[PDB]
Write a protein that binds this ligand. Structure first.
Ligand SMILES: Nc1ncnc2c1ncn2[C@@H]1O[C@H](COP(=O)(O)OP(=O)(O)NP(=O)(O)O)[C@@H](O)[C@H]1O
Ligand SMILES: Nc1ncnc2c1ncn2[C@@H]1O[C@H](COP(=O)(O)OP(=O)(O)NP(=O)(O)O)[C@@H](O)[C@H]1O
Ligand SMILES: [Mg+2]
Ligand SMILES: [Mg+2]
Lengths: 345, 345
């Protein structure tokens, strides 16, 4: 009842972020997404995140990685632009300037897929956090060992200028580690842990992944989204996912999260006004693009896993899901948005 | 009305360039196409152009690139011949002679896909421009950073011997940069900019890519193609394309442009006379092979993007389009040409 209406309503708000597929748009206005990771042996995760982003709808996806992983990742798909610029044989200044060059061409950077924990790649991720901080129109999604960096240096996400534009996606153990760093007591009510952590991290948006996902930026969900009672300060996605717990499904999530974050950010900026999607009136929607991107992506990713599991069952691997992103996008966003009168979504 | 009749007529002339698939032809007479590019990290664009060329109908497609990109590009397809001869550890003379060896086996060289802007690859492209200039039966298609070289040294396309045989394919910004180099005033009428630039570049044929494509070699479109009024000096392709602005669709265009340029050039040379396609009577058609190849490829590429977008929608990537070149070729050229009595096209 209430839960179904609220879920549909918030999903509808997420759908409102999506630019129409319109003759007047040119290459790049539907999203330029970067994935920073791919160290050493970790080839699959940055592919899943970046190719997931392309199948979800990005015009361009960039992978920023080390040379060895980069050579593998390029063979998976000619549609990815793979920058092997995190070469430990390069000076730090050269890496910083190479990273700045690529990042200046991005709406959103996903930090973490296949990043690993060694000093070099962690330092490269820290550089990227620092550049993103000072690029006010840059969104950031943090996953995998990107979250290890936050756990070690939480200030990398704290006190950013501009609108809020960070989404963290910890699994159960990554979340517990984050809470321990921020001295958040685990005896708290289960649904209060995520808003506490988000608050302690300067109201970044956090997707706490699990049997259900708990989403929060630490603030109450404004009237535009969620009587005499205050609106909840978290959202819980319980939509049916898949039953096969094969590795990589969080990378589909980060890639699709990054795309929705880029679209919603460009939407609020006014980029889609000339194709009939002007920014929203309500300041609360502008301030909550990360929560809407997060809620939409969480919902979508479980639906992708559900459909992949219906097709493949016990045999499902995450590579299968990359091929199903398009049809599930059409189910969740494209066909509903078009029937809603939003244009070809 | 008039626009539909003219479009169909010019497309019919482009179709007349296509050799029949005939038992008497042997390997290579339906096109030996080269793509010069593939530097550093840029793996996808030369694949899209060269594999697009093969799916369009070339007998052999060659990629001329650096070793690192070449190793990736080879894994995409055993049908491409990848020459990793642009090795910066090789002497210039060795590169020149290696390039000359491969180019002497080509009808057409596509310069630019994944070329990049660094001194080495730009110098390799300049060598290739110089050899092509002095190989009178060699056609050239210039895209991507091949156009950066022209923008820096426009003489590389000026004063070529033989028939005109160069086609440039700038997008909106590349076109503006070219106009600035050639001191062409942007206040001019919109459809007069492309013929002015082509004229300033010695009547090379230019595809100005955009919401529609404007095609011109700077000269009026002769009576064979376009009362008391002079024929237009440009053609405009407005056929429906796709709505997904994913990167790489200009590489499908360059590969298909290169194939049509090779076929039309061999056709005028007399190569297909013994299989029932003698050269055209009209000198204007011979002088306008580049415009016909350009018009046919522009039309075809938007139709490919249209069909790929109908199948994949928001999820379309350019890799999907490579697989659809064959069926769209059959729609645009093969089945119409056969019903026209041109043989199995
Ligand atoms: N029990 C569950 N039932 C259904 N969906 C689930 C379940 N647990 C997690 N998910 C979903 O599966 C995806 C990945 O979640 P989860 O396995 O918790 O993260 P992870 O450990 O980071 N995965 P990975 O990408 O392999 O590193 C998310 O979309 C979750 O919502
Ligand atoms: N708004 C549009 N609607 C439909 N087709 C378009 C539109 N803009 C460009 N095209 C076509 O898309 C293809 C690529 O054009 P365009 O994006 O302008 O070039 P580009 O920037 O060089 N692309 P790329 O190959 O990624 O570098 C051409 O076949 C164009 O005719
Ligand atoms: Mg994970
Ligand atoms: Mg281009």
């Amino acid at each position: 009842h209430m839960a179904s209406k609220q879920h549909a309503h918030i999903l509808s708000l997420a759908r409102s972020m999506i630019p129409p597929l319109h003759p007047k748009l040119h290459k790049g206005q539907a999203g330029r997404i970067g994935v920073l990771g791919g160290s050493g042996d970790y080839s699959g995760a940055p592919y899943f995140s970046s190719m997931g982003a392309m199948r979800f709808g990005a015009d361009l996806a960039h992978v920023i990685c080390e040379p060895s992983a980069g050579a593998v990742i390029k063979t998976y798909s000619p549609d990815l632009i793979v920058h092997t610029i995190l070469d430990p044989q390069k000076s730090r200044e050269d890496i910083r300037s190479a990273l700045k060059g690529v990042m200046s061409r991005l709406h959103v950077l996903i930090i973490g897929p296949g990043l690993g924990r060694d000093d070099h790649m962690q330092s490269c991720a820290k550089i990227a956090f620092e550049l993103a901080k000072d690029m006010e129109q840059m969104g950031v999604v943090v996953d995998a060992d990107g979250l290890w960096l936050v756990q070690n240096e939480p200030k990398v996400v704290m006190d950013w200028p501009g609108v809020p534009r960070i989404i963290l996606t910890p699994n159960v153990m990554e979340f517990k580690r984050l809470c321990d760093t921020m001295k958040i007591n685990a005896s708290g009510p289960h649904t209060s842990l995520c808003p506490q952590l988000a608050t302690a991290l300067g109201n970044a948006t956090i997707i706490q992944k699990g049997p259900s996902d708990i989403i929060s930026n630490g603030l109450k969900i404004p009237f535009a989204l969620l009587e005499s009672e205050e609106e909840q300060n978290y959202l819980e996605v319980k939509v049916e996912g898949g039953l096969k717990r094969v590795g990589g499904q969080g990378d589909i999530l980060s890639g699709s999260t990054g795309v929705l974050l880029a679209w919603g950010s460009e939407w609020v900026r006014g980029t889609y006004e000339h194709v009939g999607h002007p920014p929203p009136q309500d300041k609360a929607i502008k301030e909550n693009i990360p929560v809407l991107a997060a809620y939409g992506a969480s919902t979508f990713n479980r639906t992708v896993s559900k459909r992949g599991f219906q097709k493949k069952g016990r045999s499902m691997v995450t590579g299968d899901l990359v091929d199903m992103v398009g049809e599930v996008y059409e189910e969740v966003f494209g066909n509903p948005g078009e029937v809603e009168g939003r244009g070809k979504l």
